[PDB]
Design a protein around this ligand. Structure first.
Ligand SMILES: CC(C)=CCC[C@@](C)(O)[C@H]1CC[C@]2(C)[C@@H]1[C@H](O)C[C@@H]1[C@@]3(C)CC[C@H](O)C(C)(C)[C@@H]3[C@@H](O)C[C@]12C
Lengths: 9, 242
């Protein structure tokens, strides 16, 4: 979720 | 495959590592004489357990963020599905940090570079987990005795992270293929630099056991201090470990 964001951005 | 293609993988992994380090090796070397005084040590030891936990988890989380960036630059990693990217990071990121910390460890006096100076494991006494701390420090001493080059750490840490045996992987074949190409690249590089003797000396279950000990210690701390965990531990830390 934070991981999701770090992986996307 | 061919040698050029393998050697391209080696250089690509080493570069990804270099750009995602956080602290450059020469910075860490140049501070080795800057050791906490007995009074600074005492100051750390007198901190409350919950305060020392929060500070440590903060620095660990910052370290993990650099590991995520390393993963995202690893050739093949971003082409795996997101479910698999997350599985690999959840199981792997702490193991990466534990390998990467041997750079910050001075085996001549058994200290680690923490918040601007080097200090011994006694600095961390207020955590209440001497047994885990002792084993981390020993683990780092083992790794330091190998004299890893920056290239060896890069390749080895790539392999720690790209592990096709992690439970939960949806396309375990694709990860196996990546892992085998990384393994070939690592072994190639060792064969070319006359360093194959290290293969025997790399740690066995050992990384797994340290990460397990971390998690069981966290469950004890959060049972005794649940609001502290909710209010003051980093979000990323809770997402990986709670
Ligand atoms: C108390 C507990 C179970 C968890 C939190 C604390 C522990 C036990 O898991 C303890 C285990 C050992 C510990 C002190 C760790 C801290 O959180 C995070 C640091 C750092 C990664 C922080 C950043 C620094 O750049 C470097 C030099 C890389 C540090 C490492 O040298 C030592 C390390 C891994």
């Amino acid at each position: 979720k934070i991981l999701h964001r770090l992986l996307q951005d | 495959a061919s040698l050029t293609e393998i050697e391209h993988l080696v250089q690509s992994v080493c570069k990804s590592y270099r750009e995602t380090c956080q602290l450059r090796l020469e910075d860490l070397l140049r501070q080795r004489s800057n050791i906490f005084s007995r009074e600074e040590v005492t100051g750390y030891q007198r901190k409350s357990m919950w305060e020392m936990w929060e500070r440590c988890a903060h620095h660990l989380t910052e370290a993990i963020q650099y590991v995520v960036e390393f993963a995202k630059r690893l050739s093949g990693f971003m082409e795996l599905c997101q479910n698999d990217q997350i599985v690999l990071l959840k199981a792997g990121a702490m193991e990466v940090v534990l390998v990467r910390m041997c750079r910050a460890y001075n085996a001549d006096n058994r200290t680690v570079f923490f918040e601007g100076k080097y200090g011994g494991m006694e600095l961390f006494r207020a955590l209440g987990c001497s047994e885990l701390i002792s084993s981390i420090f020993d683990f780092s001493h083992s790794l330091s005795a190998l004299h890893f080059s920056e290239d060896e750490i890069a390749l080895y840490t790539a392999l720690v992270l790209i592990n096709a045996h992690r439970p939960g992987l949806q396309e375990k074949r694709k990860v196996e293929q990546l892992q085998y190409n990384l393994e070939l690249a690592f072994h190639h590089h060792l064969c070319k630099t006359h360093r194959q003797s290290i293969l025997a000396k790399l740690p066995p279950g050992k990384l797994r056991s340290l990460c397990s000990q971390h998690v069981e210690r966290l469950q004890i701390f959060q049972h005794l201090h649940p609001i502290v965990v909710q209010a003051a531990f980093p979000p990323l830390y809770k997402e990986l470990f709670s």
